[model samples]
Target: VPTAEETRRLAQAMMAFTTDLFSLVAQTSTSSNLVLSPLSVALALSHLALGAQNQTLHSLHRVLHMNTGSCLPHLLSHFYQNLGPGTIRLAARIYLQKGFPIKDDFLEQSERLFGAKPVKLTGKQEEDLANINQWVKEATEGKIEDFLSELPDSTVLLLLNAIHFHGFWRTKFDPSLTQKDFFHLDERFTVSVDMMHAVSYPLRWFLLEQPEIQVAHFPFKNNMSFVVVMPTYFEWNVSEVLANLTWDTLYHPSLQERPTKVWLPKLHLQQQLDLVATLSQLGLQELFQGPDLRGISEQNLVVSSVQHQSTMELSEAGVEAAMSLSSFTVNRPFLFFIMEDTIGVPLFVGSVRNPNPSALPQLQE
Candidate 1:
């Protein structure tokens, strides 16, 4: 873990890394609906970075690939593409710092950073569920439940806890109006789920094309933020649009001088996927490669095994989940930031849908 100021810088670096990493993932698939919050995402990613030896743009991709969720295989494949000739050499380095033979390592770290230790999701469904609930309580500052009664145990790994922290749009919806809405992937039957409703302070950017592209900035106390890049309409390729995104592009220095007000409707989202499958697809065939994480440290051991799981849940209390699972109900005003939480740093600060556009659009008189 880094000092507060250092954590801020690290947060910025990690955000950039995450931006680039997810951009690649978006180009390849659309089945995964992944939204990583600041605190949890930062801690997990930072620890992985510290454990890596010769840190590079792609090293973070390797760990995230094994994180167990819909994007795992895809991210792992990304890591493999860069594996080249010195695969074993790199894994050993990372293992020396990050890999622990026993589960206690994860538990201890979880306790230190999150206040409570990470409980293993054993075979007993009730026990596993309790762990999930407890994890949520610790992560969200008690805003969310400790365990989600609705989800099953088989889905626990991809369903339970790790990426810590929980928050929501401070303005939530009236449960009565929180009905099923359509996520129009196409004109056909829309993916239906309950969407949360609320009025938020957004930083909505404009687009010349139809069904405009909207960007929402959610900042945190430490200057870290959860940026929501949403398209007004789902007809266009989100990957294509998100691909062109750069730190400057979204946080345009010239355009960010002002603010904007917009109406964001409630959303209905229900998709849970385990990224382990995608890891293999992404190319990281050997996740527990003790000798593979050369960027961190060399180890006498060989890559043995790698396992990952995630979980998330959303209700009136707010959103909660374990591992890679994320549950958020965007309902009100919440701080947003581009962060390096491990070092506690903030980069390109802005609020979701907050108004600010560069020189007024040129219009024909």
Candidate 2:
């Protein structure tokens, strides 16, 4: 078991990694809607690290900000258990090519530490693809479906991680308060979105310096919260703001309580990202190319791809499966970060360029 200090350090490292990942994804997705589960990606990498050895293991540990000697798998397991299964849920799995020699120890650790197992591919590409997609859909409660549309014949191993979060606001938003409003996509573009309102709700609010952003912390059931960060001015630099973000800096200002009025768009968002190139760019190059993952098997193996997909919906009548108060209008582009309240580990981070573009069915209705 890791000490409290060790847990804190690891949690901080995860947050820092989240910042970097958001920056990488944001740079390429500037003109579109974006969503990512940093926790899901990190969890997938954690499983991969369990099979890593040699210099590859060293690089992996360094990238995760973990001591090579640390019992990260067990510690991560403990953390997930502490999160409880009521509101936030995380799961991982690996699809191994039929007849691949996966070590028993690796299989045991994956199952014991992460509740994941190796499923043999059915040889047929279409059948294997459907199997993988089915796991993802079930893991995310059908919020995400068709995660893998195709599978390559030569693919030997596929690692997957999925997270689904559904929680009602502690103080639920009123359905009658929802109204259609304009969301500015940019100076020259805008779209009509359903906006929800709340008046005089006691919520934690923060005004950040350096990058000048307003952050609001809205509590939910079961020790979870969505920390929404928006730049105070137009054409804001999200990367710059993320670089300055730390758990302390974010929570300090939010400590003060105030009666706040909040107006936010009811949102339904989904994002799919291929992180192979992005991870390689972030100094995790060895794993995808030819890392010595001998701990998993004697067969030659290298990561072919890393993919992540997530979905979120917000509306009145509580979240069914899944707010702070402040005088703020979420009518412009902004960032939404979901996290566990206790350890402050970020579960999801995203930029909403446009909310409910097609005005789909009320996510909570």
Candidate 3:
């Protein structure tokens, strides 16, 4: 793992990738109730980087905002160990075509740097698919079973990462509210959403001087934060908030704990991002376009894809899984980021909006 100083450096890189990454997903996502793991995406790419050389290697550096040169392995090592799950259950594995020529160094460093082990595929598309799916099912502790649809016959390798996380919904009340939704109905209403309410709760929040944004840092008992960036005026441009988003700002002196009433929608967000499509916007096209991974093998390897998926649930508190009179509510559309307070990087980021926008805009009497 990286030292305190280097962890800070690594975190800044994650912040950069996460900011740009979410911009692409939020701006282009077909689903509004979406979530993503930038950590998972980078880890997948980091493992791939183990076998990368030349342009492939340098390009990975730029994409990751990595300042490490000889310490490249250091950063890679840092990225893996800290992923000890916490409230976030993370799993990674590399499934290689059986008998594929992968270098010993690549294999050793992969296991050494990242905990992901190499498993072999028999190339019987059905059998390998089932085998891989079974591992995924077990990985997320049975939360995901059929994450992949089909496999190509000429498949060379598959890298997979899964996140199943749940944190306390702020040691307070429960998930059942109808009038609360009606009271906040000026924002919009979806019966599908269960609003959790609190009369008075203690939390830290900051109001950005620019862009009419509110940043709230709500915590679970396990040292993780579920942060919300809400625009009072309801603007769709997330870039504005992300521009000012950082770990320090969330805890800035401008923010202090207070007794506030909050109504947070219980979020059961699940999303699978086609990272290759998303990262391409950030200039990660070389890996797919006749590339070099000679460090892994001389098979002239080119990456086929990189995928990141998540399943996160939020509720009252143990295995399952909020407010004040000076209150906060998420009735309108907003963005969310879940982070590990220790590591200072987002485990997941996504947006949640009313399921259907066309509601009673004139229902106020």
Best-fitting candidate, measured by TM-score?
2
TM-score between candidate 3 and the true structure: 0.87
What's the TM for model 2? 0.90
Off by over 4 Å in 2: 252-254, 317-326, 359-365
Give per-candidate clash totals.
90, 6, 8
- Cα-lDDT of candidate 3: 0.71
lDDT of 1 by residue, 118-213 (tens): 233355666655655565565444544433444442231121323322334323334555555433333343344455443223333434244344
Per-residue lDDT of model 2, residues 1-365, tens digit only: 67888887777877877887888888877446777887778778877778888887787777767677776566666777777665665557777777778899998888888766778788898788887888777776666677876778677667776666666787788778888877777666678888888777667877777778888887777677778888866686668777767776544343866788878888777776678888898888887778788888887778876777766776664543218543777877888888777777777888886786674323221
- Native-vs-model 1 lDDT? 0.35
Which 10-residue span in candidate 2 carries the lowest summed lDDT?
356-365
TM-score for model 1? Answer: 0.46
TM-score of each model, in listed order: 0.46, 0.90, 0.87
Writing each residue's lDDT as its tens digit, candidate 3 over 120-145 gives 77879888878877888877777777
Q: Where is model 3 more than 4 Å wrong at Cα?
A: 70-80, 83-86, 169-192, 244-247, 251-254, 318-324, 355-365
Q: In order, what lDDT does every prediction score?
A: 0.35, 0.75, 0.71
